[PDB]
Design an enzyme around this catalytic site. Structure first.
Site, mmCIF file in Angstrom:
data_model
loop_
_atom_site.group_PDB
_atom_site.id
_atom_site.type_symbol
_atom_site.label_atom_id
_atom_site.label_comp_id
_atom_site.label_asym_id
_atom_site.label_seq_id
_atom_site.Cartn_x
_atom_site.Cartn_y
_atom_site.Cartn_z
ATOM 1 N N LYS A 281 -46.511 -29.470 8.210
ATOM 2 C CA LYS A 281 -45.376 -30.180 7.628
ATOM 3 C C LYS A 281 -45.027 -29.650 6.247
ATOM 4 O O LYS A 281 -43.883 -29.383 5.960
ATOM 5 C CB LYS A 281 -45.669 -31.677 7.590
ATOM 6 N N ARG B 114 -46.234 -43.207 5.768
ATOM 7 C CA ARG B 114 -47.487 -43.068 6.521
ATOM 8 C C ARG B 114 -47.935 -44.358 7.193
ATOM 9 O O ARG B 114 -48.915 -44.349 7.933
ATOM 10 C CB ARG B 114 -48.629 -42.615 5.606
ATOM 11 N N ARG C 164 -57.889 -24.139 6.079
ATOM 12 C CA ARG C 164 -56.906 -24.267 5.018
ATOM 13 C C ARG C 164 -57.540 -23.975 3.652
ATOM 14 O O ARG C 164 -58.651 -24.460 3.349
ATOM 15 C CB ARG C 164 -56.308 -25.675 4.986
ATOM 16 N N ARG D 57 -59.941 -27.715 -0.163
ATOM 17 C CA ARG D 57 -59.836 -29.153 -0.488
ATOM 18 C C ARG D 57 -61.089 -29.877 0.022
ATOM 19 O O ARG D 57 -61.552 -29.633 1.128
ATOM 20 C CB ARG D 57 -58.571 -29.778 0.154
ATOM 21 N N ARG E 128 -59.680 -38.592 8.625
ATOM 22 C CA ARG E 128 -58.229 -38.500 8.421
ATOM 23 C C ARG E 128 -57.465 -38.569 9.739
ATOM 24 O O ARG E 128 -56.394 -39.172 9.797
ATOM 25 C CB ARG E 128 -57.849 -37.221 7.669
HETATM 26 N N1 LIG Z 1 -47.603 -41.832 2.180
HETATM 27 C C1 LIG Z 1 -48.910 -41.938 1.889
HETATM 28 N N2 LIG Z 1 -49.554 -43.117 1.939
HETATM 29 C C2 LIG Z 1 -50.862 -43.238 1.642
HETATM 30 N N3 LIG Z 1 -51.654 -42.225 1.275
HETATM 31 C C3 LIG Z 1 -51.086 -41.000 1.216
HETATM 32 C C4 LIG Z 1 -49.685 -40.767 1.500
HETATM 33 N N4 LIG Z 1 -49.426 -39.444 1.337
HETATM 34 C C5 LIG Z 1 -50.597 -38.872 0.982
HETATM 35 N N5 LIG Z 1 -51.576 -39.813 0.932
HETATM 36 C C6 LIG Z 1 -52.984 -39.616 0.508
HETATM 37 O O1 LIG Z 1 -53.187 -38.235 0.222
HETATM 38 C C7 LIG Z 1 -54.109 -37.691 1.161
HETATM 39 C C8 LIG Z 1 -53.690 -36.280 1.530
HETATM 40 O O2 LIG Z 1 -52.362 -36.325 2.059
HETATM 41 P P1 LIG Z 1 -51.495 -34.981 2.130
HETATM 42 O O3 LIG Z 1 -51.490 -34.374 0.754
HETATM 43 O O4 LIG Z 1 -50.222 -35.451 2.796
HETATM 44 O O5 LIG Z 1 -52.412 -34.014 3.050
HETATM 45 P P2 LIG Z 1 -52.290 -33.644 4.622
HETATM 46 O O6 LIG Z 1 -51.051 -32.775 4.696
HETATM 47 O O7 LIG Z 1 -53.570 -32.891 4.957
HETATM 48 O O8 LIG Z 1 -52.164 -34.965 5.334
HETATM 49 C C9 LIG Z 1 -54.092 -38.678 2.328
HETATM 50 O O9 LIG Z 1 -55.218 -38.556 3.200
HETATM 51 C C10 LIG Z 1 -53.999 -39.980 1.571
HETATM 52 O O10 LIG Z 1 -55.222 -40.249 0.889
HETATM 53 N N1 LIG Z 2 -47.702 -22.951 12.796
HETATM 54 C C1 LIG Z 2 -48.852 -22.649 12.188
HETATM 55 N N2 LIG Z 2 -49.772 -21.853 12.758
HETATM 56 C C2 LIG Z 2 -50.935 -21.565 12.150
HETATM 57 N N3 LIG Z 2 -51.275 -22.025 10.940
HETATM 58 C C3 LIG Z 2 -50.414 -22.840 10.298
HETATM 59 C C4 LIG Z 2 -49.148 -23.203 10.884
HETATM 60 N N4 LIG Z 2 -48.515 -24.005 10.015
HETATM 61 C C5 LIG Z 2 -49.322 -24.163 8.955
HETATM 62 N N5 LIG Z 2 -50.443 -23.420 9.110
HETATM 63 C C6 LIG Z 2 -51.654 -23.462 8.303
HETATM 64 O O1 LIG Z 2 -52.326 -24.666 8.768
HETATM 65 C C7 LIG Z 2 -52.756 -25.456 7.648
HETATM 66 C C8 LIG Z 2 -51.976 -26.761 7.566
HETATM 67 O O2 LIG Z 2 -50.625 -26.552 7.129
HETATM 68 P P1 LIG Z 2 -49.967 -27.588 6.117
HETATM 69 O O3 LIG Z 2 -48.577 -27.098 5.891
HETATM 70 O O4 LIG Z 2 -50.877 -27.826 4.956
HETATM 71 O O5 LIG Z 2 -49.925 -28.898 7.063
HETATM 72 P P2 LIG Z 2 -49.600 -30.455 6.737
HETATM 73 O O6 LIG Z 2 -48.715 -30.465 5.525
HETATM 74 O O7 LIG Z 2 -48.945 -30.936 8.029
HETATM 75 O O8 LIG Z 2 -50.965 -31.087 6.525
HETATM 76 C C9 LIG Z 2 -52.611 -24.564 6.437
HETATM 77 O O9 LIG Z 2 -53.849 -23.875 6.265
HETATM 78 C C10 LIG Z 2 -51.486 -23.608 6.821
HETATM 79 O O10 LIG Z 2 -51.619 -22.334 6.208
#
Ligand SMILES: Nc1ncnc2c1ncn2[C@@H]1O[C@H](COP(=O)(O)OP(=O)(O)O)[C@@H](O)[C@H]1O
Ligand SMILES: Nc1ncnc2c1ncn2[C@@H]1O[C@H](COP(=O)(O)OP(=O)(O)O)[C@@H](O)[C@H]1O
Length: 203
Positions: free
Chosen positions: A13, A85, A124, A150, A161
């Site tokens: 995303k 979320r 990642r 991370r 998660r």
């Molecule tokens: N809209 C939201 N509501 C609650 N917690 C959030 C939200 N967005 C992010 N978080 C917090 O930040 C953490 C990481 O989220 P994010 O940065 O979106 O990583 P990822 O793309 O791996 O989900 C979540 O597991 C939660 O702790």
């Molecule tokens: N279509 C894809 N195929 C393979 N790897 C991807 C793809 N999209 C993202 N990645 C990788 O997968 C991981 C998650 O992407 P990220 O954009 O952080 O996801 P989100 O914001 O949904 O948690 C990162 O390590 C990124 O480099």
């Protein structure tokens, strides 16, 4: 145009949102990125949010709703990326937007199976100074770029998660479906193919 990107962690995303924002001029609102900045700065929000994030739990809704009220772009195109979320967050967003005569135009659901999620998250790596995201297999950082893993991308926290996503976030699929604005993406494909699908929706 107002977009929400919805789907499991690791679906890509953020990757797609950053590209769409730059190429088409959307404002990118990532609650995760904003929360990480707050944690770094040691603000009241950051200090409180930190332990939830570390455990792989969601940050409490009222904190997030206030954050979005504070940063909401009043005009122009927006991508809400990883917000909402929870159902309460989504209800709050709808109420905010309606007061401004706006609405969510499309919710893009990034569908991807758990096994793929786990590989994406495990591999990642991020530049902690810029937030730029890499993957040890699918997009490794070039020489000179220091990255970290991370702490919430470790195996036990990934597991938590994904559980949290299924319980609290996945109901949003039905919430938005019933508004008639849900669009489905196959986010298991390679990055270019996912982007093509994103472009197809918004056009
Ligand atoms: N809209 C939201 N509501 C609650 N917690 C959030 C939200 N967005 C992010 N978080 C917090 O930040 C953490 C990481 O989220 P994010 O940065 O979106 O990583 P990822 O793309 O791996 O989900 C979540 O597991 C939660 O702790
Ligand atoms: N279509 C894809 N195929 C393979 N790897 C991807 C793809 N999209 C993202 N990645 C990788 O997968 C991981 C998650 O992407 P990220 O954009 O952080 O996801 P989100 O914001 O949904 O948690 C990162 O390590 C990124 O480099």
């Amino acid at each position: 145009m107002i977009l929400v990107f919805l789907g499991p962690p690791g679906a890509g995303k953020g990757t797609q949102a950053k590209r769409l924002a730059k190429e088409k001029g959307f404002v990118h609102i990532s609650t995760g990125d904003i929360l990480r900045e707050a944690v770094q700065k040691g603000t009241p929000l950051g200090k409180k949010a930190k332990e939830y994030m570390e455990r792989g739990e969601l940050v409490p809704d009222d904190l997030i709703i206030a954050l979005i009220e504070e940063v909401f772009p009043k005009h122009g195109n927006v991508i809400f990326d990883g917000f909402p979320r929870t159902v309460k967050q989504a209800e709050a967003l709808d109420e905010m937007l309606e007061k401004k005569g706006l609405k969510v135009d499309h919710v893009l659901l990034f569908e991807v199976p758990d096994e793929v999620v786990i590989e994406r998250l495990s591999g990642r790596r991020i530049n902690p100074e810029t937030g730029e995201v890499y993957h040890v297999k699918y997009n490794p950082p070039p020489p000179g770029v220091k990255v970290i893993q991370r702490e919430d991308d470790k195996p036990e926290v990934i597991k938590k998660r994904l559980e949290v996503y299924r319980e609290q976030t996945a109901p949003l699929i039905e919430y938005y479906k019933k508004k008639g604005i849900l669009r489905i993406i196959d986010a298991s494909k390679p990055v270019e193919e996912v982007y093509r699908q994103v472009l197809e929706v918004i056009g």
